[PDB]
Design a protein around this ligand. Sequence first.
Ligand code: ATP
Ligand code: MG
Lengths: 49, 181, 48, 158
Amino acid sequence: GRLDRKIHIDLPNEQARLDILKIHAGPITKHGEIDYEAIVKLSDGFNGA
Amino acid sequence: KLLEHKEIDGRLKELREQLKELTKQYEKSENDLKALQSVGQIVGEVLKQLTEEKFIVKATNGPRYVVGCRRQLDKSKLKPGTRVALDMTTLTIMRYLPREVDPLVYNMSHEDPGNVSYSEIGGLSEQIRELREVIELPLTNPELFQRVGIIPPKGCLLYGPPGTGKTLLARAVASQLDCNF
Amino acid sequence: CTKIINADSEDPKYIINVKQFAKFVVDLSDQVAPTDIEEGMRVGVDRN
Amino acid sequence: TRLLDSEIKIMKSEVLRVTHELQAMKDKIKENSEKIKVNKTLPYLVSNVIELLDVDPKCAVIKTSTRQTYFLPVIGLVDAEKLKPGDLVGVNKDSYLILETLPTEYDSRVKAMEVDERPTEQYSDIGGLDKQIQELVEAIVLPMNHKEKFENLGIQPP
Ligand SMILES: Nc1ncnc2c1ncn2[C@@H]1O[C@H](COP(=O)(O)OP(=O)(O)OP(=O)(O)O)[C@@H](O)[C@H]1O
Ligand SMILES: [Mg+2]
């Protein structure tokens, strides 16, 4: 009746982590070949920050 | 040939050019002297009227006064609770004013140079829909809930570990919606 | 006794704050030099 | 007809009259400026601007530092284009009109914590902290003097 809805924003998943990495690593002037799978596997319990 | 007046004509033209600025200066001086012949008025709130010519009004501070009103002013707009301006030497009703807006609320009303959209936030495509289900659809198409026979909720809160994207989502919602905020 | 809060250049135009009354814009007197008028310290002030 | 001296005389009289009028207007302007400067008694009253309300047949609503609310049918000697809700203004003590605009004020404690006398210690008198010094200098000093090395790559500083 005052705060009707409680919304939870938990830590990102592997797909969510890959999405955030693709969002933030885009604009940088990259070179060569990049492999996001190892980065996703290593980063556990991380945040967008 | 006929330039006997040409030198004097040029002198007159230069004098007129100077007189243009001299008249702008005279006008500026006139506005300056005219502006400095007015005084301010105290501000208060009306409570009720005793008779045709007597009201009782309360200033912003404590004291309450029994005062008169101007003759030409309309008396049909002076309902209790409105804001009025009174003379500082006789305390007579002179003018009614609209409701106040605080400078703090004015600053709070609009402060957002950010322009973040939904493309810069990812990984929580379900909670964003859950939130938008509350503040977007009912405010535009309100007959659906009336047809079903319920009332949409009012508020909600977001919680979780630090740095998961709460204030960012709030900024995106505020920056991508056409309504008072 | 009052407290100066700040100042401005090329003219004293000192901003004076008091505990109960309002704050004003003021200047010095004739016998006081502008050297020892550093901000944030208590000063004497007329009544009028 | 032939040439006539009447035009020269008329033009000379017009030039002289216009010059005399300009001189008289300048004298009147000087007198009015003297009167305006007479009304600028130095003790003002600092106050805060609440509203620049618009009315029809600009009017200000202000809050003096002595806890009084005032309504001004006219602004005064300051244009209304450079006023915002919350500005700090000096107001005439009796007529209660804006006379000038003042800079934003800050707390004395906040102002007193800014450095004045720079220290004299150099990097040469610290031993055994090379990695820490390098890691600190590349995150504070570097993004100030070499910003062009950052946006050329597309990376935000720490
Ligand atoms: N899903 C996401 N996609 C992209 N960036 C994200 C996401 N979640 C968080 N971020 C990053 O988080 C940063 C700041 O997060 P934010 O201010 O929303 O913190 P928070 O979750 O509200 O935490 P807190 O307020 O408790 O400190 C943003 O600059 C952004 O880069
Ligand atoms: Mg936050």
